[PDB]
């Protein structure tokens, strides 16, 4: 493609303060914390990831940081910098309310059509931006969208995201453990991932939400998923979903990838629906100097 002039920032440990922990194991510890640039007279809420040395882990995380640095959008969670302590740390924008998946679950009784539809839009928007940056997320899930505010969600955790090389339209992945129930078929069959691979995962993500955090193909062993999809079976229609919404989800689960909708179409469609939420989704009755990361832009 063109030169990637993303800026990568290196930060001092003394520059940021850990306040508490928001989950830890299986990776390392993610801390709530605050980062204060040296002269700036501002304090920025952040999430700090300190790796659980093992060279392998440092490699992985730096790759994560490489990806985040290479993206700037309102709808993609922002990466502030990295710290080269003994244990490498990744500083990123803090989304106070946690993953959307857990969020929808804890609040079924309060999420309304407006909230849901808007979210669908915000993610389509976020994702479409990654399409622009020639990026294949490869692990789009409700668990990987985090909530900045109830009105604002952002995509994050690019554990498996990959940036397409130039004149490269598919990514072929060596075997590893991967989200199965979220994956497109081609991805399962041929370990091929594309943006339209990402769309299917988008369609599932919406289903994840419209069921208020249900588990797709619950019970069904991941081993048997490919047969089913090959058979033409798909996820069921959520109770609250008008035909319109669900139809949209289904088109994401078509076998022919160019058959699936592009993200821009998804944005445009959900936006019209979000104009009139209650018609498209049916629900049972409807710190002094702190600056958000989005509002902060680096010196020079
Ligand atoms: C789906 C969860 C998931 O995938 N995890 C695993 C580790 C986490 O990571 C990150 N976490 C965050 N931020 C973050 C902020 C806030 C919270 N909690 C969740 C629980 C909630 N309550 C606890 C108290 N109860 C009484 C009510 C519910 C408070 C908010 C969890 C996570 C971030 C980030 N950028 O903010 N980033 C990561 C990735 C490193 C996500």
Curated annotation (Swiss-Prot):
Outcome of swapping residue 28 to S: Found in a lung cancer sample
Residue location of crosslink Glycyl lysine isopeptide (Lys-Gly) (interchain with G-Cter in ubiquitin): 20, 41, 56, 59, 169, 231, 262, 272
Effect of residue 23 to C: Found in a lung cancer sample
Effect of residue 23 to S: Found in a lung cancer sample; somatic mutation; strongly increased kinase activity; constitutively activated kinase with higher levels of basal autophosphorylation; more sensitive to gefitinib than wild-type
Phosphotyrosine modified-residue sites: 171, 296
Location(s), subcellular: Cell membrane; Endoplasmic reticulum membrane; Golgi apparatus membrane; Nucleus membrane
Superkingdom: Eukaryota
Site (Important for interaction with PIK3C2B): 296
Modified residues (N6-(2-hydroxyisobutyryl)lysine): 49
Effect seen on changing residue 13 to A: Found in a lung cancer sample; more sensitive to gefitinib than wild-type
Impact upon substituting residue 71 to M: Found in a lung cancer sample
Tissue expression as described in the entry: Ubiquitously expressed. Isoform 2 is also expressed in ovarian cancers.
Active-site annotation: 139
Entry binding sites for ATP: 22-30, 49, 92-93, 157
Recorded consequence of changing residue 38 to K: Found in a lung cancer sample
Residue span(s) of domain Protein kinase: 16-281
UniProt PTM comment: Phosphorylated on Tyr residues in response to EGF. Dephosphorylation by PTPRJ prevents endocytosis and stabilizes the receptor at the plasma membrane. Dephosphorylated by PTPN1 and PTPN2.
Similarity comment text for this entry: Belongs to the protein kinase superfamily. Tyr protein kinase family. EGF receptor subfamily.
Assembly, per entry: Binding of the ligand triggers homo- and/or heterodimerization of the receptor triggering its autophosphorylation. Heterodimer with ERBB2. Forms a complex with CCDC88A/GIV (via SH2-like regions) and GNAI3 which leads to enhanced EGFR signaling and triggering of cell migration; binding to CCDC88A requires autophosphorylation of the EGFR C-terminal region, and ligand stimulation is required for recruitment of GNAI3 to the complex. Interacts with ERRFI1; inhibits dimerization of the kinase domain and autophosphorylation. Part of a complex with ERBB2 and either PIK3C2A or PIK3C2B.
Disease in which the protein is involved: Lung cancer: A common malignancy affecting tissues of the lung. The most common form of lung cancer is non-small cell lung cancer (NSCLC) that can be divided into 3 major histologic subtypes: squamous cell carcinoma, adenocarcinoma, and large cell lung cancer. NSCLC is often diagnosed at an advanced stage and has a poor prognosis. Neonatal nephrocutaneous inflammatory syndrome: An autosomal recessive disorder characterized by intrauterine growth retardation, premature birth, fragile skin, recurrent skin infections and sepsis, failure to thrive, nephrocalcinosis, and nephromegaly with tubular dysfunction. Some patients have chronic diarrhea, and necrotizing enterocolitis.
Described function: Receptor tyrosine kinase binding ligands of the EGF family and activating several signaling cascades to convert extracellular cues into appropriate cellular responses. Known ligands include EGF, TGFA/TGF-alpha, AREG, epigen/EPGN, BTC/betacellulin, epiregulin/EREG and HBEGF/heparin-binding EGF. Ligand binding triggers receptor homo- and/or heterodimerization and autophosphorylation on key cytoplasmic residues. The phosphorylated receptor recruits adapter proteins like GRB2 which in turn activates complex downstream signaling cascades.
Record's protein name: Epidermal growth factor receptor
């Amino acid at each position: 493609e063109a030169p990637n002039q993303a800026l990568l920032r290196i930060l001092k440990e003394t520059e940021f303060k850990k306040i508490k922990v928001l989950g830890s194991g299986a990776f390392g510890t993610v801390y709530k914390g605050l980062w204060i640039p040296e002269g700036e007279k501002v304090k920025i809420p952040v999430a700090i990831k300190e790796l659980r040395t093992s060279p392998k882990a440092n490699k992985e995380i730096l790759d994560e940081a490489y990806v985040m640095a290479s993206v700037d959008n309102p709808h993609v969670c922002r990466l502030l910098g990295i710290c080269l302590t003994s244990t490498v740390q990744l500083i990123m924008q803090l989304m106070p309310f946690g993953c959307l998946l857990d969020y929808v679950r804890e609040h079924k009784d309060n999420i309304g059509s407006q909230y849901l539809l808007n979210w669908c839009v915000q993610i389509a928007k976020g994702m479409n931006y990654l399409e622009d940056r020639r990026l294949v997320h490869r692990d789009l899930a409700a668990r990987n969208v985090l909530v900045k505010t109830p009105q604002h969600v952002k995509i994050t955790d690019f554990g498996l995201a990959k940036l397409l090389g130039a004149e490269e339209k598919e990514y072929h992945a060596e075997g590893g453990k991967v989200p199965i129930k979220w994956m497109a078929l081609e991805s399962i069959l041929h370990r091929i991932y594309t943006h339209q691979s990402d769309v299917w995962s988008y369609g599932v993500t919406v289903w994840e939400l419209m069921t208020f955090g249900s588990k797709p193909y619950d019970g069904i062993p991941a081993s048997e998923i490919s047969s089913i999809l090959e058979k033409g079976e798909r996820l069921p229609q959520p109770p609250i979903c008008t035909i319109d919404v669900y139809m949209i989800m289904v088109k994401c689960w078509m076998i022919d990838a160019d058959s699936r909708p592009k993200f821009r179409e998804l944005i445009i469609e959900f936006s019209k629906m979000a104009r009139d939420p209650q018609r498209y989704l049916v629900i049972q009755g409807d710190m002094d100097d702190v600056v958000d990361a989005d509002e902060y832009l680096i010196p020079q």
